[PDB]
Amino acid sequence: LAIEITTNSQEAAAKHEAQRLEQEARGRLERQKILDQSEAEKARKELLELE
């Protein structure tokens, strides 16, 4: 049992690392999403003034 509990510990650490990578990549992806939306609506300016 005490071998299996440390297997649980190491796999829990791995899951923690996986969720950390998930959330950081996801946050950077919202970062580039915000950049892309801001840039697209930067040209949506000229589109809409001359519209």
Place this chain on the structure above:
Amino acid sequence: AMSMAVESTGNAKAEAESRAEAARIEGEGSVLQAKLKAQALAIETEAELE
């Protein structure tokens, strides 16, 4: 926000200037319509005067 500003400007600006610049046409209509009815009514009235 300054985007939505430019759409709002364009929309309200366009509608209002269309109405005003059409009112220019009804205005010149009034101008020369008064000018024409002037002499028109003038000749009816000076023909009924005798």
